Each structure stands twice: as C-alpha cells, then as structure tokens.
Amino acid sequence: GPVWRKHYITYRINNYTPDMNREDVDYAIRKAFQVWSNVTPLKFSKINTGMADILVVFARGAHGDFHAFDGKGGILAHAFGPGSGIGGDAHFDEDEFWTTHSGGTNLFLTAVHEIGHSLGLGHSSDPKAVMFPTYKYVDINTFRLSADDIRGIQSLYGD
Ligand SMILES: CCOc1ccc(-c2ccc(C(=O)C[C@H](CCN3C(=O)c4ccccc4C3=O)C(=O)O)cc2)cc1
Ligand SMILES: [Ca+2]
Ligand SMILES: [Ca+2]
Ligand SMILES: [Ca+2]
Ligand SMILES: [Zn+2]
Ligand SMILES: [Zn+2]
C-alpha cells in the first residue's frame, strides 16, 4: 500500500555484523539496492552520517522496535514499508551467520528481499520471485528478479 513519494532515496548502515568483512557488508547492501534501481526510476544514495530514509541494522533479540528477533533460524530479518521514522528500515538478525555465499545466511539475497519490503512490496506466491515469503539460496552471480518481482515494483514506481 505505502510507497515512497519520491525517486531519490537514501540509506545508511548503522552497524556491521562481525560475521563478515566490513567491505563485504557494504557491497552486499549496495548490490541489493542496485537490483531494484536497475528496473525502476529509483536512485539510491548511501550516507555515512546524517539521517537516511532506510536504516540498515544488525541486531539480536529485542532491539527497540517491538519486534524482537528469535535466535538462530526462524525469522532472519525484517523490514518496514515506506514511511517516516522507522518506515523503510531493514534489520538483520545477528543470531544468524551472515555470509557472502553459501556458508550460512546470504546477506545479499536476504537484503534484496528486505529492501523489496522497504520499497513497499509484499509477498508473492510466485516461487520464482525474490519476494516469495520463504528464504532460498541461489548462486548470487546469476541471481535475477522474476517477472513478477519486476511487475510489482514497476506498478509502484514505473519504468
Ligand atoms: C532468489 C532468492 O530468493 C529469496 C526469497 C526470500 C528470501 C527471504 C529472506 C528473509 C526472510 C525473513 O527473514 C522473514 C521475514 C518475516 C517478517 N516480515 C516482514 O518483515 C514483512 C514485510 C512485509 C510483508 C510481510 C513481512 C513479514 O512477514 C520477511 O518476510 O522479510 C524471508 C524470505 C530470501 C531470498
Ligand atoms: Ca532468527
Ligand atoms: Ca526510515
Ligand atoms: Ca551473526
Ligand atoms: Zn527490527
Ligand atoms: Zn518478507
């Protein structure tokens, strides 16, 4: 339902999981945003200080937003749809072991999914869609949004 009422969107990574190298975390997030900017008019800018539309945070259990994480497994992360304050923010359960590839929960793939929510997309029934409600691992270098994912994000932002 909610949508960002602009095309220039900013994000900021509040903290970094010790699971990965700082650079790998920044890259995974940057790449996830580009997945969406590539098929819409949306342009994402990363800020290292100041307010951002989308705040990326790694945390375990209760972290202040009333939706406490649940330990290893189960919910891996969560995000809030477009809106002020908490709206748009993407949180990742530190109790998961974040990885660049298959050695655990893939940050890149998870981020693409969560940012979809940050942009206003809900869950699809299409098993091929990244917005499908259940996590799935695939070779990150050959990852591609499904036609359903594209249709959904373009009906919201065009292009
Ligand atoms: C080719 C790769 O395909 C993939 C497809 C799906 C996923 C994937 C990644 C993470 C998760 C989760 O951690 C579960 C998490 C649950 C909470 N959660 C939300 O934040 C949310 C926002 C908007 C609508 C519904 C929900 C919702 O149920 C949630 O649904 O965000 C679930 C699925 C990862 C990769
Ligand atoms: Ca969890
Ligand atoms: Ca926000
Ligand atoms: Ca961790
Ligand atoms: Zn949270
Ligand atoms: Zn989801």
What is the CATH third-level topology name?
Answer: Collagenase (Catalytic Domain)
Biggest sheet overview? 5 strands, mixed
Bound molecules: ligand DEO, calcium ion, zinc ion
Number of helices: 3
Helix-and-strand structural type: alpha/beta
CATH architecture: 3-Layer(aba) Sandwich
How many domains, as an integer? 1
Query: What's the arrangement of strands in the largest beta sheet?
Result: 2-1-3-5-4
Strand content: 15-25%
Number of strands: 7
**What is the subunit arrangement here?**
monomer
**Strand and helix order:** EHEEEEEEHH
> In angstroms, what is the radius of gyration?
14 Å
> What is the terminal-to-terminal distance?
19 Å
- Residue share in helices? 10-25%
CATH class: Alpha Beta
Question: What shape does the CA trace take?
Answer: globular
Q: Write out the CATH superfamily name.
A: Collagenase (Catalytic Domain)
Binding site for Zn(2+) 1: 63, 65, 78, 91
Subcellular location: Secreted, Extracellular space, Extracellular matrix
Binding site for Zn(2+) 2: 113, 117, 123
Active site: 114
